[PDB]
Structure 1
Amino acid sequence: NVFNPAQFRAQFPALQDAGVYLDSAATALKPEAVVEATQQFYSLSAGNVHRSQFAEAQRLTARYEAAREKVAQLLNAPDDKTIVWTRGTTESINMVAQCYARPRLQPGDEIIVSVAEHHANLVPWLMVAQQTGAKVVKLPLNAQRLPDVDLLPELITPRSRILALGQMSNVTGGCPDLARAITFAHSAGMVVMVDGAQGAVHFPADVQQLDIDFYAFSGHKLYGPTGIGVLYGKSELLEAMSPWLGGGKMVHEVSFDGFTTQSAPWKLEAGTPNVAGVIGLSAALEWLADYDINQAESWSRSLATLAEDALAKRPGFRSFRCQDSSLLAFDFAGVHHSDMVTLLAEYGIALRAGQHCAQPLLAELGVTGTLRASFAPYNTKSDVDALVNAVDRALELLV
Structure 2
Amino acid sequence: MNVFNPAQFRAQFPALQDAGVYLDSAATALKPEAVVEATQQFYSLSAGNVHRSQFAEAQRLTARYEAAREKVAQLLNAPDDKTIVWTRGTTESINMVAQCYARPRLQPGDEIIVSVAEHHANLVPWLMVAQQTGAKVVKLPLNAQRLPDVDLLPELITPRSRILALGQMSNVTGGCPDLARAITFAHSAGMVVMVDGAQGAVHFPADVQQLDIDFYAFSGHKLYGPTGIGVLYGKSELLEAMSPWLGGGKMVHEVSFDGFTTQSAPWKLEAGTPNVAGVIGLSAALEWLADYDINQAESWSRSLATLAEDALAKRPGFRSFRCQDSSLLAFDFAGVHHSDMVTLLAEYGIALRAGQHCAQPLLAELGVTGTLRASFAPYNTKSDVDALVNAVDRALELLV
TM-score, with length taken from structure 1: 1.00
Hey, what's the Cα distance between the residues in 2 that align with 1:368 and 1:50? 56
Q: Secondary structure at 2:43's aligned position in 1?
A: helix
Deviation track 1:123-175 (CA, whole Å, cap 9, x = no partner) reads 00000000000010000000110000000000000000000000000000000
* Structure 1 residue 267: Cα displacement: 0.2
Identity of aligned residues (%): 100
Q: What CA RMSD, in Å, does the superposition of the two structures yield over aligned residues?
A: 0.2
Deviation track 1:286-345 (CA, whole Å, cap 9, x = no partner) reads 000000000000000000000000000000000000000000000001100010000000
* Structure 1 residue 113: Cα displacement: 0.1
Residue equivalent to 1:222:
223
Kindly report structure 1 stretches of 4+ aligned residues shifted beyond 3 Å. Answer: none
Residue equivalent to 1:297:
298
Hey, what's the Cα distance between the residues in 2 that align with 1:165 and 1:129? 17
Hey, what's the Cα distance between the residues in 2 that align with 1:167 and 1:245? 27
Deviation track 1:44-78 (CA, whole Å, cap 9, x = no partner) reads 00000000000000000000000000000000000
Hey, what's the Cα distance between the residues in 1 that align with 2:269 and 2:352? 36
Residue equivalent to 2:153:
152
Hey, what's the Cα distance between the residues in 2 that align with 1:101 and 1:263? 18
Deviation track 1:206-247 (CA, whole Å, cap 9, x = no partner) reads 000000000000000000000000000000000000000000
Q: Secondary structure at 1:281's aligned position in 2?
A: helix
Hey, what's the Cα distance between the residues in 1 that align with 2:44 and 2:25? 29
Hey, what's the Cα distance between the residues in 2 that align with 1:397 and 1:235? 58
* Structure 1 residue 82: Cα displacement: 0.1
Hey, what's the Cα distance between the residues in 2 that align with 1:173 and 1:37? 31
Hey, what's the Cα distance between the residues in 2 that align with 1:143 and 1:176? 12
Hey, what's the Cα distance between the residues in 2 that align with 1:311 and 1:257? 67
* Structure 1 residue 107: Cα displacement: 0.2
Hey, what's the Cα distance between the residues in 1 that align with 2:340 and 2:50? 56
Q: Secondary structure at 2:12's aligned position in 1?
A: coil
* Structure 1 residue 92: Cα displacement: 0.1
Hey, what's the Cα distance between the residues in 1 that align with 2:388 and 2:130? 43
Hey, what's the Cα distance between the residues in 2 that align with 1:44 and 1:205? 35
Hey, what's the Cα distance between the residues in 1 that align with 2:177 and 2:339? 30
Any residues of structure 2 matched to 1:165-176 within 5 Å, and which? Answer: 165-176=166-177
* Structure 1 residue 204: Cα displacement: 0.1
* Structure 1 residue 99: Cα displacement: 0.1
Hey, what's the Cα distance between the residues in 2 that align with 1:162 and 1:319? 32
Q: Secondary structure at 1:26's aligned position in 2?
A: coil
* Structure 1 residue 351: Cα displacement: 0.2
* Structure 1 residue 271: Cα displacement: 0.2
Hey, what's the Cα distance between the residues in 1 that align with 2:380 and 2:40? 26
Q: Secondary structure at 1:126's aligned position in 2?
A: helix
* Structure 1 residue 396: Cα displacement: 0.3
* Structure 1 residue 93: Cα displacement: 0.2
Residue equivalent to 2:309:
308
Hey, what's the Cα distance between the residues in 1 that align with 2:72 and 2:60? 18
Residue equivalent to 2:127:
126
Hey, what's the Cα distance between the residues in 1 that align with 2:387 and 2:368? 26
Any residues of structure 2 matched to 1:29-44 within 5 Å, and which? Answer: 29-44=30-45
Query: Can you give the 5+ residue segments of structure 2 that lack an aligned partner in the other structure?
Result: none
Residue equivalent to 1:14:
15
Query: Can you give the 5+ residue segments of structure 1 that lack an aligned partner in the other structure?
Result: none
Hey, what's the Cα distance between the residues in 1 that align with 2:183 and 2:121? 20
Residue equivalent to 2:259:
258
TM-score, with length taken from structure 2: 1.00
Deviation track 1:92-128 (CA, whole Å, cap 9, x = no partner) reads 0000000000000000000000000000000000000
**Number of aligned residues:** 399
Hey, what's the Cα distance between the residues in 2 that align with 1:39 and 1:249? 26
* Structure 1 residue 394: Cα displacement: 0.2
Hey, what's the Cα distance between the residues in 2 that align with 1:101 and 1:49? 44
Deviation track 1:15-34 (CA, whole Å, cap 9, x = no partner) reads 01000000000000000000
* Structure 1 residue 177: Cα displacement: 0.3
Q: Secondary structure at 2:93's aligned position in 1?
A: helix
Q: Secondary structure at 2:85's aligned position in 1?
A: strand
Q: Secondary structure at 1:259's aligned position in 2?
A: strand
